[PDB]
Amino acid sequence: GMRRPTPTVYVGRVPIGGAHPIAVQSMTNTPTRDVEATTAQVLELHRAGSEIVRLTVNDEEAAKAVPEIKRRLLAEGAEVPLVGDFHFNGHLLLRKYPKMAEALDKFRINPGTLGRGRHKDEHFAEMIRIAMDLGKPVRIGANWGSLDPALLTELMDRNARRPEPKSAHEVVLEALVESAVRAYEAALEMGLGEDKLVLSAKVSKARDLVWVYRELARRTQAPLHLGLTEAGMGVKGIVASAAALAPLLLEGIGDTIRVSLTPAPGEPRTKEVEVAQEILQALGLRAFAPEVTSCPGCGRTTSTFFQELAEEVSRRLKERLPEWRARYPGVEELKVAVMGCVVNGPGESKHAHIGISLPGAGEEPKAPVYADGKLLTILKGEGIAEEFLRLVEDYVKTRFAP
Amino acid sequence: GMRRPTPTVYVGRVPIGGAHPIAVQSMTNTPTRDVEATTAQVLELHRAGSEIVRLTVNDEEAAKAVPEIKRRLLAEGAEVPLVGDFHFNGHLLLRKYPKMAEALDKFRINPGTLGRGRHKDEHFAEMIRIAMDLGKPVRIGANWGSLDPALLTELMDRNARRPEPKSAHEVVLEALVESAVRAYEAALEMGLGEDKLVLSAKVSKARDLVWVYRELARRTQAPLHLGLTEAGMGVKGIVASAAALAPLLLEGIGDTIRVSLTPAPGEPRTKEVEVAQEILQALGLRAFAPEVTSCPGCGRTTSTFFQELAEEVSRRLKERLPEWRARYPGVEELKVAVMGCVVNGPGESKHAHIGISLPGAGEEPKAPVYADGKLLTILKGEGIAEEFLRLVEDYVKTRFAP
């Protein structure tokens, strides 16, 4: 599959663009002024796999905290880049708090939260000037929840002159794209480099997101920050996010992703990082950790042992990963199968690196194990689970040896 | 978006094809011979939204149970169609147990589990003959876990003659498609109607599934049963399934879906139905229930109240749905927003049918509510949650009145 070529934008030490792995990012939900809480959550998110972390810089007390948060991160060798999220008063905060401006690795601007009418262009120019002075990259990030009303009215009037006007909904999507593209072009014209500009234009419906990003990809050369905004809670948020991103990622569009989940009360903020990683890995774009392929089970499946075994294998693989990642380069690509009966068991197992096919209904009580597409052994009796996990360990040591 | 046109195939009373809603299906995991357990699970799945339910018919005792399961379903007015899943001995079971053959609403055949060499064609013909005699529809369902080895060798040899041979992996995908297409054409040639044939060709990797179904859609006219086989457990299974199906559904390919999740020990079998519904609804293809759009929350968000409120609104909407579905036609389309601050709160709320924007950091402690894109009221104090839910109820009564 062919990735859209783009210039490289470094966000701290992390390169993003068409020549680089698609980067996972996230955002904190602690008050930025709370240095201890925010530092801890940045570290938690980074350790979960957030390669870039965003934090809101909403007021003066937030701005004053940012240099200390960065200092603390660096003191433990955590080189995770920080993106500051600015709305309404970004120009004032960046002007008044130069140490915050220098401590951030990237500024996020929203062309719909710059101020009204004439103030907009001036506030934009000031934030871009500061970024240029400090050599910082910028994301120009549009969101349909904060669309520039003057631009919307301009495009509504253009639409009304068409021989067949489009729907109001379609015009909103046009305006969102136009907001991002106009601001991109303005920033380039002011002298901000192509190696310093990332774009997003987010909406909260999957089919609309696909249209928007196809337009952005066509009309601009910038790396794109992709996400389905306001995806919501639980299973709904997870599914909507994956459904929205996949068609675009498969087409080669997108250079960094963020998954916008609402945590349930007491649910960890790291869930969104896990989902982002799973999207990229599902599409074969990155490898973060070994994966288990398993059938759903059906009436052919002999007992609850199948579900238990699949769960145990997944759990063990998670426990071994920190060590394996250190010793066995490439192990993140490991595919393990655990299957319920002979119908698909051998075949699916032979497509994995290693897999086991349990005996289902009507079969002799033995479980063949396949590795690299051929029979490795046949297991029987008690301790199938512990035997198989030993065989997986043995496999990893040989296949992913340095 | 434009749906691929196809003939209509009735599965019991449920029509599938390009002129009809994309149908959600599932499969039982109880032993089919256990009439009480299987009947109960069929009912559970149907009540969760499984429009078609599949059950394995693996042996003689399974076959003998099917008529009683169907009888019990019909006794409670549950007209849910049953698909029988046959492997290895389907021809023997359908021949020996005509009451099972008549009680099923559809037969699933796997061209890779028919038997070896010469036996294959005969077993296929017999199952198709029985379907034709009884006026039953058939799914010819290929799976890469049970690929016909003779066909694979044929295509491996064709590939080896190419000036630039493809990879072994690519040949497997070619063979999977060819298996389904050849069997489709054979069944048509035997006289099975176009209104009696559904096709699937499942693989366990998302990008490969997209290639396969694009080929099936091009080379055949049949309605397509789409699924990512062996998607696995937990978040991984959910994300992979959504990621695989979305690009195809957005392109108009697919007439019925099944989500192939491995339940965790003690996790309900209905989870896969919930995920299938969420995929279709995320893509705007079906509406099953009201949805809540909510931001992730960030450091602008004032307290834990935001996450609590979003959760409470979602919970209330789920509680009201059975009643609402009866009284208020079209309510399944309801979009509700719950947002954390002024940045995107008003704008996202104005895109929903009704939404609330909480006050975040720096804002006065008041929460505007929007409905049909304009200000409805402004809430303050305690009981915001109960006030908003009353306003949502009031909205539904007026907007979705019969």
Ligand SMILES: C[C+](CO)[C@H](O)COP(=O)(O)OP(=O)(O)O
């Ligand atoms: C953080 C923010 C400002 O527009 C949001 O409200 C939601 O976060 P998000 O879904 O990642 O979308 P943004 O990048 O923030 O537009």
Ligand SMILES: C[C+](CO)[C@H](O)COP(=O)(O)OP(=O)(O)O
């Ligand atoms: C049931 C079956 C027979 O091929 C499977 O093993 C898995 O179920 P599935 O993922 O829905 O795939 P199938 O339609 O069954 O091929």
Ligand code: SF4
């Ligand atoms: S591999 Fe066997 S046990 Fe697993 S779902 Fe398929 S037919 Fe059922």
Ligand code: SF4
């Ligand atoms: S709407 Fe406000 S509270 Fe919600 S994530 Fe966005 S900026 Fe943060």
